[PDB]
Design a protein around this ligand. Structure first.
Ligand SMILES: CCCS(=O)(=O)Nc1ccc(F)c(C(=O)Nc2cnc3nc[nH]c3c2)c1F
Ligand SMILES: CCCS(=O)(=O)Nc1ccc(F)c(C(=O)Nc2cnc3nc[nH]c3c2)c1F
Lengths: 276, 269
């Protein structure tokens, strides 16, 4: 039944995930596996019971667009091993190497993302940090949804990690999240808005607000709704129905935002109306 | 926690998968899904508790080379829904359409298969019917291991299209449990022999009884002088090693995977 991977089965190799909360390594375990070690310097029960529950959230997922949970580790460190995806990550493509994606693909990458999210939700999971850097293009045509694990084990734990990954990701925070209004700003629609920003990523190939150099104002304005994405950049050939759906996903007023089933539906349809 | 898919979420469409053991349909459930319905005309407890346990075997698996278990169904029929793989199936490629695979790939397809099997085993699962028709090439470059589910729900419920991959000690039903890791290896051997030759073994003997008789008496084995010219000597050697009539002389998968991972990084120059 259970997924705990014993000490020394996983062969931790080349390093790649650099952050402060955990560290991602390419590894080997019945073949190529990614492994993220939480570098929490060994628990410390029952922090340990709280990590097991977060794994519980993970294995609730079995979908071809959610990243595949493979097993976890308590022995040398804490960790999570997931499949290894050969190929980069939407962010890297759009913003590091500046891949020119054909439009048919872009819509495709939107769908899959939408596909997966619809799933994450259907099973009561809120991602809490969708963004192009957690969307991985595997073998360049499949989408795997990324860094949604844990969270419960981040707002109750000590480190500079709820000051980093609340930071490197603000561009995708819907307003009602930016200004920490209360306890739970996060919600399906929180997730949608982010989906909206990746949409705006795909369709423009830039990150929003590339001309404002102080990252405080971005925060101030976005949450006060003085600032929003410049929807006059969806590249010429961006289908009107999409640009429309994007703008729909990005509503400052979280209640005017579509949930994902409807979002997926309007993408599955605008697709079958193009190649002619 | 649980995977039971309620009635009428799955949209069963175009038909494809033939036979008893199950009939397979392309479907839709959070996107494209394959579904196999057991057409057992509704249980009949507690046959039903015995199908749930077979699913239990399935969800023990989470690997990028084992086919992805997605959820099961008790409502309209019994069923299992798995991911939908776009593209064919090793058997179809090699023997129906006759794909010319570049050798670097062939070895790759061997590895992945070996990759997945090593996994199936590590977690105490015996496949009991590896064969090119349960190896699916998804998007043509990834390998998903196939029809290993159930089995406990097949020998207790009311062997042919797959004999070519049966190690001898299995063919002649010697006793109760002929099946074992090495049983599986021999089959892996035959897919190897498939990849490396592009034919099914014994293509010149037209009575399917003798195949059975001889193979199990060890009078007949695969014609290893067919591994196409450029088949690396180290592989042809490993194949022959995987195919030993004496099940104890067969390598387990870790070693098998190891000798494939190595003969790979020694070729492109
Ligand atoms: C659904 C996965 C469980 S998660 O903790 O939410 N996510 C989670 C957990 C552990 C990881 F290593 C990762 C991850 O970044 N994996 C990962 C996968 N393939 C890669 N190819 C290059 N770099 C990679 C990283 C992950 F995204
Ligand atoms: C018996 C338990 C389920 S399993 O053995 O793990 N998997 C399993 C079992 C039975 C099937 F027919 C299938 C199956 O046909 N899957 C399948 C998946 N994608 C396909 N694209 C075209 N044809 C396909 C078939 C399967 F993937």
């Amino acid at each position: 039944d259970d997924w705990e991977i014993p000490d020394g089965q996983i062969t931790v190799g080349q390093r790649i995930g650099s952050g402060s909360f955990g560290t991602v390594y390419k590894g080997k375990w019945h073949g190529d596996v990614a492994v993220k070690m939480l570098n929490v310097t060994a628990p410390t029960p029952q922090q340990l019971q709280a990590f097991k529950n977060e794994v519980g959230v993970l294995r609730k997922t079995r979908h071809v667009n959610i990243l595949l949970f493979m097993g976890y580790s308590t022995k040398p460190q804490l960790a999570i091993v997931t499949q290894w995806c050969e190929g980069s990550s939407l962010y890297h493509h759009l913003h590091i190497i500046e891949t020119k994606f054909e439009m048919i693909k872009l819509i495709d990458i939107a769908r899959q993302t939408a596909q997966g999210m619809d799933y994450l939700h259907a099973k009561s999971i809120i991602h809490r940090d969708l963004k192009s850097n957690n969307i991985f293009l595997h073998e360049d045509l499949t989408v795997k949804i990324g860094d949604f694990g844990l969270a419960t084990v981040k707002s109750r734990w000590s480190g500079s990690h709820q000051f980093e990954q609340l930071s490197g990701s603000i561009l995708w925070m819907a307003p009602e999240v930016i200004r920490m209004q209360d306890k739970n700003p996060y919600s399906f629609q929180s997730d949608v808005y982010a989906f909206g920003i990746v949409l705006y990523e795909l369709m423009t190939g830039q990150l929003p607000y590339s001309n404002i150099n102080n990252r405080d104002q971005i925060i101030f304005m976005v949450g006060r709704g003085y600032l929003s994405p410049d929807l006059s950049k969806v590249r010429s050939n961006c289908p009107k129905a999409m640009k429309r759906l994007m703008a729909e996903c990005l509503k400052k007023k979280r209640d005017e935002r579509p949930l994902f089933p409807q979002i997926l539906a309007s993408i599955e349809l605008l697709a079958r109306s193009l190649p002619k």
